[PDB]
Symmetry: C3
Subunit: 314 residues, 3 copies
């Protein structure tokens, strides 16, 4: 099965300039060459060039709405096409607002997909409930059917069409939710495993339930949107919104080793790596290294080892 | 239900001067304003002023006996009164010797209470078995009935009356016990989950057993005495007696999210925060922050989120 | 039961000069005096003096064949003798190539023994599959029956005779295996718990299965070969081949508290402590301290406490 990488060096969903240098640090760490070592074929589409929208006034409280919308509508066109040619898309970005295009474009081709959203945040604030004008906590509000017509249309997102329902997404690692967001997840009946649920069941029992929830009835493609801040700041410090008490390096890997075993991984997101926020060089390398290990695990690199087939090593 | 905070800036139970600045660092970190954001009513009794006892000679090996005894008899009078008016007491202290007054005064009003003692130490040395004259590892020896008349009366503690039995207390996080203490817990049949028990069962299974042990037969108020050193030195470094291999930030929170769900939390202790022992400013803030998060969790702040009731966020 | 310590300051199994100062740093940390505090009798055989072999030409790709072989044949003569006199051998070494003599000499006396191999590596490369001429990842290939005659005889190892079968060894902590090694463990049917298995079952469930696997049918002596690099680089940094995502200080201890409870610990190995690779003094002390705590736990030091018998502390 083919794998195609797509760079999304975009950072208008957040105050923090810097995340536009993420695909570059990842690529700079051997991400593309290591992928060729698996049993997959890798092609580097290359970074996208988002055309800046001038005089992009703020919509009420939301910042850079049109720049984020047009830049997203663009990832959408690229993902759908690559999905079209039966290939797995791996988007290296930028802040998490790029999940609007990455997930919608994926659903155009595979409308029966489900979403595993590993994050310390629910990123489900609507244009109204936000305390900031930051779109990095709103992507999911633009993707859910149940949330359509619940908030005024944001200039730049009329091309989006809520594709997945609150029932086709699962949250993993939550530990920082806004009163608004929590009220939404409780009202919509969204399946989630916050840090306390993970403490109770153990990552193993968790992954084993999300699969019988999403894949229980009918097997379907899986979209894996990974926000580096789902892991504790000790492993992935280079993120703009780190929160203590996160998933560990080991649990991080476990989620990706299990999602591979399903043979359903259709789309992948590695968001929020900001190389300019590592207080010291050590921190960044740490964030980039664990980010590369998560991507490799989604495509075969297991912790027990790996020996090429039809080969007798003796 | 009402919550009433009580500052106990006392440090005569230990060599280490410094823990008298704890209630101040916690209050300085938003502890009282954050509490007002829950569904409880908070009232700040303020710090107590312990009158120093002159010529407080040592009793055998025990240090400052009368200063610790009179200072304790004082917390006792304050807790009982606040408990009286049907309010939950939250004592910000000092070293852990202040658990004598905090727990005895609580039992005067609620004699059927049980004690959950999260700590890396059993603090059950009697005046004889101690290797030091430090009362921070003796509080529990003054509170157990089974240990009355087992050691000579220490000048200053004749006002105490062993209230709870070895069967109404449970230990969580033990990983540093004295030959004397371990012998006592094995002879009295005290229920405990040392670090190895937590490794075996997982914090979840643990909390689920201590509740069927203490609350199994009859439901009764719960006293939660939290010694910051129960958590690994990585999360709460600012403690005079740190021990590697402790409960984690995540497990720490889990214990407090579970004790809330019971609806029984009657008394709370946040002991051993010593703002003057954090090698760097980072360390203290880290100790104070996790200390605040533990207190907020005992009163509703969950990791899955929180949305005020009778409020439609859409 | 008697305990006898044996220093193996050897480092010809690796490029990295330095591990010959391990027994010295451990002894320098109170390892021998702390052991006398348990209910065992400790005797310090002292360090061995390995006679260097001159003109020790490389065998194909393997380095210092004869120096490693003759130095091993020597540990073999010392372990067997001490085992003979019904004593528990505790070898402080060197790189992990010294497990050839330590395990073979143990089997001469107890041929029905089983091996618990805690390591981040399988150290099962044969002289052919290695990418290096390093013997610190080949010890197990010289000890298995099933692997005899599968590779040319290495000058210096004619004295060894594969004693245990692939079915009498269990791996704990694997997270760095070579295509060659993994192929071998899958072909021989060797029982192992890689880091992902430990994440799934929890250390507790793991130790509970390795015991019903090795000790299920017949009870027999146990050989415990501990490679400090089985623990994450945070706890034991002073190792030549550290790998992220390791067992923790807590899990490390749990494995040793459980192996004691069996009453079968016959032989112990504490390999790979290299005092000269700790970037800062903090790192070494950290490696040595956790190394001492693992040895003490294998002989009684529990985390719940310890009170001498027939003693009334009241
Ligand atoms: Mn996000
Ligand atoms: Mn996030
Ligand atoms: Mn204490
Ligand atoms: Mn303590
Ligand atoms: Mn090894
Ligand atoms: Mn190793």
């Amino acid at each position: 099965k083919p794998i195609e990488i797509i760079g999304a060096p975009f950072s208008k969903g957040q105050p923090r300039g810097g995340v536009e240098k993420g695909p570059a640090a990842l690529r700079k760490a051997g991400l593309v060459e290591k992928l060729k070592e698996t049993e997959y074929n890798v092609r580097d589409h290359g970074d996208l060039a988002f055309v800046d929208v001038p005089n992009d006034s703020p919509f009420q409280i939301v910042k850079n709405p049109r720049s984020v919308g047009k830049a997203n509508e663009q990832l959408a066109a690229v993902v759908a096409e690559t999905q079209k040619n039966g290939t797995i898309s791996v988007v290296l970005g930028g802040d998490h607002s790029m999940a609007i295009g990455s997930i919608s474009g994926h659903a155009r081709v595979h409308p029966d997909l489900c979403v595993i959203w590993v994050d310390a945040h629910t990123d489900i604030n609507t244009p109204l409930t936000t305390s900031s004008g930051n779109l990095d906590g709103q992507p999911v509000a633009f993707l859910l059917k149940e949330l359509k017509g619940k908030f005024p249309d944001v200039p730049g997102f009329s091309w989006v069409t809520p594709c997945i329902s609150a029932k086709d997404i699962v949250y993993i690692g939550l530990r920082d939710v806004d009163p608004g967001e929590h009220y939404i997840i409780k009202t919509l009946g969204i399946k989630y495993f916050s840090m306390t649920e993970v403490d109770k069941l153990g990552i193993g029992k968790v992954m084993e339930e999300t699969f019988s929830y999403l894949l229980g009835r009918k097997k379907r493609p899986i979209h894996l949107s990974f926000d580096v801040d789902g892991l504790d700041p000790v492993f992935t410090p280079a993120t703009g919104t780190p929160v203590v008490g996160g998933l560990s390096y080991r649990e991080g890997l476990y989620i990706t080793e299990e999602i591979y075993k399903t043979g359903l991984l259709s789309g992948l997101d590695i968001m929020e790596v900001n190389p300019t926020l590592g207080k010291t060089p050590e921190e960044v390398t740490r964030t980039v290294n664990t980010a590369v290990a998560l991507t490799l695990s989604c495509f075969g690199t297991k912790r027990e080892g790996n020996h090429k087939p039809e080969t007798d090593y003796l």
